[PDB]
């Protein structure tokens, strides 16, 4: 009855694609050979978020906690709130909701409450400026991540209002057979519960690395003053590179911690962004998952998107293996017919997806 | 770091034994406590109605 996976890798993507496809899965051996074996609290609260979003889906955790049974149900949405734990920020829970977000009965108006940022997760500016435009040109038109207040780790206390309100039928078929020309490069440097000079130090470091490329650099600056600052000191920086003729974007972020020089963090995020531009072609290394997920749940046509050589990795092909494991589809990597670079063009024939929850 | 906002020229500093918490005295008749990890202020307690000349921690405590 159940499609069986092993191990606690790609856990959110497995539960998300099971909710999209409507197929009952089992995930077996959730870190069974470990000292505290089983599911952790942040992924258990992610399961609670899935039960909040859907309706009629039965999730069945075992005694030992090392295997989970997800029998999915209808995405209904509604208005909710999610008090996610301190182990993961709000980006860890709003990232897998952007897949399920445009395919529900009622529009997503959720506000997550917890830590805003993390080193190894998505931020508010990451989710917004990077991951909303790829949905914005995959078919949705009204999506917004609002910050009402933001909380840096460890105490956090920041709330984030994810509101999507375009309930599309299916995402359109992508056709990106080009490398998009980067028109500008902008960003946002944020700081909470610290001095307002750290933001300008971060901005000056990032722009002194960026100054030798002949484009236009613009980094916006926000210090957070008052109750909107949260319960902990923190600061961070997120740059995007913006192709304006099509709308594409390539982002890179990080946050500082106890003992971190802001010019160091600014130049680090600037060089990390330029390396993402190098290893990128029409997507980012982190915008690529939901890009090819929307290409695989588009119409029953061929949609083609250009990628480069260095975007192929163990993460990307374990994504492709999980996609084929759930709903039996392959990607076809055809190479381009010009040879100053190594770029494939991934053509995916999408499954015949519609959202059948939206009332007619 | 640059700790700022004392509003007169600023006398004696002290660093705590864990190297986490600094004091900052000045002629503004108040001493400020700063957390040195992010440079964030904690208190700005108003003592001493003329001028705090010196400020010193204990050996092992945060007193």
């Amino acid at each position: 009855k159940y499609t069986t996976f092993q191990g606690s890798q790609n856990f959110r993507l497995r539960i998300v694609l099971a909710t999209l496809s409507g197929k009952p899965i089992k995930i077996e051996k959730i870190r069974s050979g470990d000292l505290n074996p089983g599911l952790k609290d942040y992924e258990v609260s992610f399961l609670r978020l899935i039960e909040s979003v859907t309706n009629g889906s039965v999730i069945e955790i075992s005694y030992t906690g090392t295997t989970v049974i997800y029998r999915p149900g209808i995405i209904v949405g509604g208005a909710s709130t999610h008090i996610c734990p301190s182990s993961k920020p709000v980006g860890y829970f709003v990232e897998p909701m952007l897949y399920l977000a445009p395919f529900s009965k009622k529009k997503f108006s959720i506000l997550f409450k917890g830590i805003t940022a993390s080193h190894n997760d998505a931020g508010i500016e990451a989710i917004k400026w990077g991951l909303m435009p790829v949905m914005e040109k995959f078919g949705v038109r009204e999506c917004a991540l609002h910050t009402l207040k933001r909380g840096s780790p460890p105490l956090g206390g920041g709330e984030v209002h994810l509101v999507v309100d375009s309930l599309i039928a299916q995402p359109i078929t992508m056709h990106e057979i080009d490398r998009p020309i980067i028109s500008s490069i902008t960003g946002v440097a944020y700081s909470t519960r610290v001095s307002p000079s750290l933001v300008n130090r971060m901005i000056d470091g990032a722009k002194k690395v960026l100054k030798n490329l002949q484009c236009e650099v613009n980094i916006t600056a926000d210090v957070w003053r008052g109750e909107n600052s949260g319960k902990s000191p923190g600061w961070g920086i997120t740059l995007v590179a913006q192709s304006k003729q099509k709308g594409w974007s390539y982002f890179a972020e990080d946050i500082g911690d106890a003992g971190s020089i802001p010019e160091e963090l600014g130049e680090k995020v600037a060089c990390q962004l330029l390396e993402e531009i190098s290893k990128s072609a029409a997507v980012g290394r982190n915008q690529l998952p939901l890009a090819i997920v929307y290409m695989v749940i588009g119409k029953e046509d061929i949609g083609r998107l250009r990628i480069n050589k260095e975007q192929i990795d163990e993460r990307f092909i374990i994504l492709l293996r999980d996609i084929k494991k759930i709903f039996n589809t392959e990607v076809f990597l055809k190479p381009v017919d010009e040879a100053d670079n190594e770029d494939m063009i991934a053509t995916i024939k999408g499954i015949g997806f519609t959202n059948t929850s939206k009332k007619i | 770091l640059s700790l700022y906002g004392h509003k007169l020229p600023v006398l004696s500093i002290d660093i705590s034994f864990d190297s986490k918490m600094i004091i900052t005295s000045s002629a503004d008749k108040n001493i400020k406590i700063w957390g040195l990890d992010f440079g964030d202020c904690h208190k700005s307690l108003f003592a001493h109605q003329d001028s705090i000349m010196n400020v010193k921690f204990l050996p092992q405590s945060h007193n």
Binding site: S195, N200, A221, V223 | -
Partner: peptide, 23 residues
């Protein structure tokens, strides 16, 4: 020092933008 970075916070523009004859 960056007091102008708080003087150019979300006041009006970023506050609105950071949510998206005679005689």
């Amino acid at each position: 020092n960056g007091p102008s970075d708080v003087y150019v916070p979300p006041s009006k523009k970023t506050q609105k933008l950071l949510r998206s004859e005679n005689l």
